[PDB]
Amino acid sequence: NAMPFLERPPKLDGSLAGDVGFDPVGFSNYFDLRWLRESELKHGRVCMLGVTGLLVQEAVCLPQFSNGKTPVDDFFVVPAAGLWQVFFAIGAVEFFSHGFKLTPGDMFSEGREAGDFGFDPLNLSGNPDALARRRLVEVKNGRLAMIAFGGLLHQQLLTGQGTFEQLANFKAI
Amino acid sequence: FSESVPFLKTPTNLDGSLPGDVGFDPLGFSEVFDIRVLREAELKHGRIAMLATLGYLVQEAYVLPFFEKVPPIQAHDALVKSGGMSQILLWTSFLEIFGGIALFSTIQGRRYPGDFSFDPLGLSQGKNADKLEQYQLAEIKHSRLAMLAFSGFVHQGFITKQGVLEQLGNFRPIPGFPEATFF
Ligand code: CLA
Ligand code: CLA
Ligand code: CLA
Ligand code: KC2
Ligand SMILES: CC1=CCCC(C)(C)[C@H]1/C=C/C(C)=C/C=C/C(C)=C/C=C/C=C(C)/C=C/C=C(C)/C=C/C1=C(C)CCCC1(C)C
Numbered sequence: 001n002a003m004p005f006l007e008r009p010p011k012l013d014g015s016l017a018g019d020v021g022f023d024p025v026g027f028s029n030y031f032d033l034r035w036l037r038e039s040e041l042k043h044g045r046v047c048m049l050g051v052t053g054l055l056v057q058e059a060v061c062l063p064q065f066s067n068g069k070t071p072v073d074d075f076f077v078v079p080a081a082g083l084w085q086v087f088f089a090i091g092a093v094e095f096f097s098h099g100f101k102l103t104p105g106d107m108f109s110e111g112r113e114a115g116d117f118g119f120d121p122l123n124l125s126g127n128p129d130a131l132a133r134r135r136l137v138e139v140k141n142g143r144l145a146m147i148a149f150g151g152l153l154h155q156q157l158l159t160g161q162g163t164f165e166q167l168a169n170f171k172a173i
Numbered sequence: 174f175s176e177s178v179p180f181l182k183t184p185t186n187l188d189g190s191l192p193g194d195v196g197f198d199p200l201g202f203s204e205v206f207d208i209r210v211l212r213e214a215e216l217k218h219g220r221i222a223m224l225a226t227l228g229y230l231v232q233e234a235y236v237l238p239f240f241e242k243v244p245p246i247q248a249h250d251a252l253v254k255s256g257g258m259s260q261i262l263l264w265t266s267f268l269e270i271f272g273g274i275a276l277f278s279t280i281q282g283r284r285y286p287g288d289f290s291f292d293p294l295g296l297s298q299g300k301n302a303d304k305l306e307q308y309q310l311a312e313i314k315h316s317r318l319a320m321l322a323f324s325g326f327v328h329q330g331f332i333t334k335q336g337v338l339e340q341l342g343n344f345r346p347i348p349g350f351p352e353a354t355f356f
């Protein structure tokens with residue numbers, strides 16, 4: 001296990017992917033595991049997209065936009081009206097995907113498993129074994145994306161330099 | 174009577190169950206509090222003291238190329254304002270949250286006090302379990318020794334303004350005392 005000196009969490013069973021028994025506090029003991037897994041998948045997917053955005057906006061800038069010194073500054077140079085529609089379009093996407101069941105009690109009522117919405121433009125989710133492998137890869141890369149996005153954002157905020165450009169010259173503080 | 178102290182009795186709940194039990198508990202600490210919680214505290218103190226003693230020796234002997242060469246107390250003072258001490262505190266606290274979780278597991282029986290199953294190398298894990306208790310004894314002894322040694326170090330550094338290797342090389346008395354003349 002992840003904590004050999006501790007015991008396995010009671011609510012934690014190996015049904016979900018990425019289960020290593022890592023829950024030293026009892027978040028799963030006090031909150032629904034389906035809700036926690038949905039939040040984990042949402043954070044991980046948002047962080048994958050954020051990592052790609054941080055690595056791309058330093059290299060590619062839209063012609064109808066101003067290119068800031070860093071992607072964090074790319075956020076600032078965008079007009080606030082664009083940021084607000086981004087916010088409200090994401091909110092509309094949340095409303096459509098959750099079926100107007102934002103509250104934790106209303107969510108997971110009509111099955112939906114945990115963190116599943118229905119998204120397969122290309123059918124790569126047929127066989128259950130490959131589906132489970134894809135789930136494990138997805139959750140691991142999502143957690144790695146959370147850590148990596150935190151690191152990239154904070155290093156960009158501190159040094160004021162892009163990630164690849166920071167790799168060009170370290171400039172230790 | 175107690176083994177360590179001939180004129181005292183064996184301190185009740187103090188037997189060979191825990192390593193290094195010479196019956197030394199003149200004040201009833203093992204009766205006011207659980208003996209396993211006290212053993213966890215002793216192991217934490219001793220391990221931190223061993224690391225601190227080794228760090229004192231090496232820092233007096235050697236310094237990294239990206240750190241200012243200063244006495245260890247001056248190193249603490251300099252890196253408090255530099256942020257390195259903040260980093261050490263943050264990561265140590267992050268580990269010690271899970272350490273406290275393990276301690277709470279220890280309180281309700283279960284895991285052995287001070288045992289984290291930490292063994293990157295094959296030492297007393299498999300094929301060497303028969304030495305494990307021996308190792309345990311050695312560990313606590315070193316712990317206790319370190320808990321004294323580091324202490325002496327710093328207080329000697331407080332009285333002579335010298336490193337421990339400097340005091341070993343040049344064992345001059347307490348400053349101002351060779352002149353004496355107190356009357
Ligand atoms: C917010 C993101 C998020 C969420 C909701 C979850 C949720 C979950 N994880 Mg995942 N996980 C995450 C991020 C997240 N994780 C990251 C970033 C990593 C990489 C280290 C992991 C690695 C991981 C493993 C290896 C495992 C889980 C498991 C689980 C499940 C049980 C544990 C739990 O309840 O944690 C709840 C977690 C939170 C509520 C987030 C923590 C919030 C605290 C209060 C803030 C402190 C965190 C901070 C960033 C650390 C600072 C450190 C300091 C030195 C600066 C649950 C579904 C286990 C599982 O599959 O069980 C089903 C399992 O085995 N997770
Ligand atoms: C967490 C995710 C995230 C966030 C908050 C932002 C936010 C922002 N981006 Mg970045 N970006 C992202 C991801 C993200 N981006 C990704 C993944 C890419 C690679 C395609 C880019 C590439 C990119 C460029 C090239 C530029 C920005 C720019 C901007 C700013 C203006 C908004 C805009 O034009 O959107 C642009 C959005 C896109 C090009 C694509 C939308 C991002 C994802 C794919 C939407 C997800 C929706 C849906 C759930 C996914 C399903 C579809 C899937 C098959 C992909 C704003 C600060 C501009 C800027 O200010 O730079 C100066 C700009 O020029 N972004
Ligand atoms: C692994 C995560 C991690 C990260 C990202 C950082 C980040 C940082 N630490 Mg470190 N630190 C960590 C863990 C980490 N710390 C741990 C576990 C300890 C022991 C308790 C310390 C002890 C420590 C001390 C004592 C000091 C710092 C300092 C710093 C800061 C200055 C960075 C620097 O020297 O320039 C950039 C770094 C370099 C030039 C060194 C080379 C690093 C290489 C290139 C990167 C290698 C990978 C890197 C270690 C990431 C590891 C994780 C990754 C493998 C996933 C920076 C914010 C210093 C500070 O506060 O600033 C004044 C400082 O004095 N840290
Ligand atoms: C969240 C997804 C999203 C949706 C679903 C969506 C729908 C529509 C529709 C549909 C009915 C129209 C007709 C429309 C038109 C304009 N959008 Mg657009 N839009 C979205 C995203 C963004 C962002 C991120 C920005 C943005 C902007 C503008 C400007 C500004 C030009 C000007 O400066 O006058 C105009 C005219 C920018 C802005 O508002 O700030 C300056 C800006 O950054 N939009 N938009
Ligand atoms: C709106 C907003 C505000 C201001 C402007 C803005 C910046 C553009 C924007 C962005 C805001 C944003 C999006 C800000 C984003 C902030 C983020 C994502 C911060 C992430 C922090 C993650 C940390 C410290 C992880 C540490 C990992 C550890 C200790 C790993 C531990 C590990 C574990 C547990 C397991 C194994 C052992 C080890 C390896 C030890």
